[PDB]
Design a protein around this ligand. Structure first.
Ligand SMILES: OC[C@H]1O[C@@H](O)[C@H](O)[C@@H](O)[C@@H]1O
Ligand SMILES: OC[C@H]1O[C@@H](O)[C@H](O)[C@@H](O)[C@@H]1O
Lengths: 480, 474
């Protein structure tokens, strides 16, 4: 109906394309950043230019035959906080009781002064609520062991210790930076009578996701399919992998020898790849990415890879595209509430647009936009909104493949025995529930330097409740 | 060590290769054969209309149905309770088909077979439903994994046995009536066989029920296929293209809201004239001398598990005839099928770091054949060549069906699900991995393979038959 608008949208969509040359470039560059990040660096190198590459101090992959009594797990994500009790029954089977709760909006508002006690006191109260609901008879009696999944960068110094490096994903609470999050959590657990709950392990949600797969993958699967990566595509994005103790040079040269003599070969590395190429030397970037990064984001100049991929930021990318189109007097935003409401459009809104069909006049897209920001749309307007949404997601799914391809290349995980496949454990609302996201990740992997023959040997498998199960596996190992 | 032998194996392995050009040839020919078979012949693939028009949703729920599945090797009886929400409860008893039915030494008739099946049905009810065996009015779906000239959901005459089965007086007989008669003759007349289906058809219906509603959105199950004792697959075909179907019945189905009918391609018969199928000296020998249906099921005889181990046995004998391979005190000679696909599965992925000990034990257990390490090294090359050819041919019918129905380019992000059942696709190391490799080489390309998901349906046959029982009336 409006040709100038229809051509303006086509032009904005081309800005989101990721070519095979870009995939190859970013794959090779990612490995260079992995190698820079695997070396020791100062507390603050103005330009380290290497990935975080955080040693998680996990050296043993689960077998699936692990067995124990019910453990506890606490997972602080980017959106929800989960508590659960996991009983590992061996033979690749387990029992789980879990309660999930949203992180109250109070914690993401800078209008009020929020502190670390507010946060962990809330987490401890939920821990108590969970035990009162699922273990009412033995809440204050048992000596619970708890694995703590903290989905944020931690300067991990042991399996049970580590200081928060910097918040990400809308969290901003100053007095937590530099604090050992295990003690912070343990402190508020003691102050409500749950001193009998010992937080014996700290892990990232990437690490836990990987550990979960190693346990649940059937012996028949572990035979040919070995899980090699645990990654997340939800509110934020990140992934881990196993690195030879020799290549982890930033690890104490003494500790490496001590671990090696004990029969250990690798240690899990938390790449923290949401920070990948924070200097934007190569990452695809639009004017809307800069605006989100600099103005609306709580961590400007950080997590730039994340800000193009994870579900916390994609819906916001659409909102800025629409406002810019209204600024240019091309798209009528009517009485919508997009203006002056950052992040009002969530990725959950786009998921209803991604696969909406024109055979129903894109009625889901209409309802989703009215429900999310009281925005009315014509059919031609929804058609164009869908083109933008599908371009924003395709870029995210294509970028999502680069860190995976890069890791598989560096560790030569695909050059294995005959018929051997590798398994990539994925968790998060995006990879789990965004229509066609995994399908596009594979398309990118086939374009990556590993090629279609490589993509076929890679299996992106979902591990629901991954974060928590893995933490429990670490709790079973450590002592009370 | 034997250098002349090492070159004989390389030459036999190259004879099993399937190139991308050959896959493309066989795919297009398969589609040509599908279209021929959808025409009347008054006398192309079988392309049998199964009279199934409705795909289950997954929310179906009803009383416990019964199912009886006569495979190529086992006979199963089970009770299926459809609980809706893509879930069901099942109690089943599985039993080998006694060797008496595969021996031509004794005169076998149809009564022998169905009399045995009815007794198994009775035992099952006596063991799992003793209180309501003679009280309830059971509805039973019958899975008959053999070509049937299907004339309705509850009727159809056997066309021809396959897979070692040979019972002459069954050909031309409606197998549902035969089964129902022996059920009545032991008091189980209250068990009504209300539906007849192929194991391909049931496999598809089962997946459509179990495939999560979230999966049904983008992932639609489009094929139910089998890679076990034999091989075969089905799909949904536009009622318009099924010209061999009565033009009247077509019109009535359309008016009732129906659009497609499931087609049993019987793709084990694909290219029985060997106009294009890869053929070795050993395939002819199996077809002409050792097979129970010479000149039939030739595609099957190169793919399914009943024949792959036998292909190795003939390769070994030929190498011994040529005084190249020492067969020791083995019993391979004059013992067809003594080498099973289950024997090859232990060889496929055996490693040299263990001196290929699995292959050694597997060969001794199956035919008291001792082997040196270098001999096992070469036997592994043969096994891997036989299986790769099977998995590559196995991809052709799937690609062909997906192309004919243009199932992959139906909407943005559209994926298709192929339901697979059978000991080979389920449990043969790397079989699915090689099938996908072939699909990527097929005319659908790597972009197509990625949109295709080979999903396993363990207990499909029976659940699908139960879903047909729920529909039909007592
Ligand atoms: O939740 C996914 C990822 O989000 C990122 O912001 C954090 O830095 C990671 O630790 C986490 O794994
Ligand atoms: O069991 C797999 C297939 O084997 C073939 O021999 C039969 O003719 C088919 O009806 C059956 O579906």
């Amino acid at each position: 109906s409006d040709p100038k608008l229809t051509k303006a949208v086509d032009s904005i969509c081309d800005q989101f394309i990721v070519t095979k040359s870009k995939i190859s470039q970013l794959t090779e560059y990612f490995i260079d950043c992995m190698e820079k990040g695997l070396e020791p660096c100062e507390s603050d190198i103005s330009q380290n230019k290497g990935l975080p590459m955080i040693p998680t101090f996990v050296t043993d992959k689960p077998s699936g035959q692990e067995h124990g009594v019910t453990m506890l797990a606490a997972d602080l994500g980017g959106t929800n906080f989960r508590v659960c009790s996991v009983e590992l029954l061996g033979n690749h089977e387990f029992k789980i009781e879990q309660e999930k709760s949203k992180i109250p909006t109070f914690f993401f508002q800078d209008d009020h002064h929020v502190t670390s006690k507010d946060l962990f006191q809330h987490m401890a109260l939920i821990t108590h609520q969970f035990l009162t609901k699922h273990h009412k008879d033995v809440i204050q009696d048992y000596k619970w062991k708890m694995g703590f999944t903290f989905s944020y960068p931690v300067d991990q110094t042991s399996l049970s210790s580590g200081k928060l490096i910097r918040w990400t994903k809308g969290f901003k609470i100053g007095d937590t930076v530099g604090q050992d999050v295990v003690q912070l959590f343990q402190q508020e657990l003691n102050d409500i009578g749950l001193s009998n709950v010992h937080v014996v392990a700290l892990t990232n949600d990437t690490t836990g996701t990987l550990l979960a797969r190693c346990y649940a993958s059937s012996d028949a699967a572990r035979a040919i399919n070995e899980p090699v990566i645990g990654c997340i595509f939800g509110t934020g994005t990140n992934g881990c992998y196993m690195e030879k103790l020799e290549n982890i040079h930033k690890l104490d040269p003494a500790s490496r020898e001590e671990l090696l003599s004990q029969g250990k070969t690798h240690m899990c590395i938390n790449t923290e790849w949401g920070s990948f190429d924070n200097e934007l030397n190569h990452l695809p970037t639009t004017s809307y990415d800069i605006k989100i990064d600099q103005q609306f984001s709580t961590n400007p100049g950080f997590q730039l890879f994340e800000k193009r991929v994870s579900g916390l930021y994609l819906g916001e990318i659409l909102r800025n595209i629409l406002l810019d189109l209204e600024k240019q007097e091309l798209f009528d935003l009517k009485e919508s509430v997009l203006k002056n409401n950052p992040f009002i459009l969530t990725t959950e809104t786009l998921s209803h647009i991604e696969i909406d069909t024109v055979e129903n006049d894109l009625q889901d897209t209409r309802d989703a936009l009215l429900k999310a920001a009281d925005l009315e749309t014509t059919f031609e307007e929804r058609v164009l909104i869908q083109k933008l949404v599908r371009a924003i997601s395709r870029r995210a799914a294509f970028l999502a493949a680069v860190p995976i391809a890069a890791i598989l290349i560096k560790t030569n995980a695909l050059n294995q025995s005959y018929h051997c496949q590798v398994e990539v454990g994925c968790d998060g609302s995006v990879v789990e529930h965004y229509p066609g996201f995994r399908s596009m990740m594979r398309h990118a992997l086939a374009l990556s330097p590993i090629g279609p023959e490589g993509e076929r040997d890679v299996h992106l498998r979902i591990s629901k409740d991954g974060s928590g199960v893995g933490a429990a596996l670490c709790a079973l190992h450590a002592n009370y």
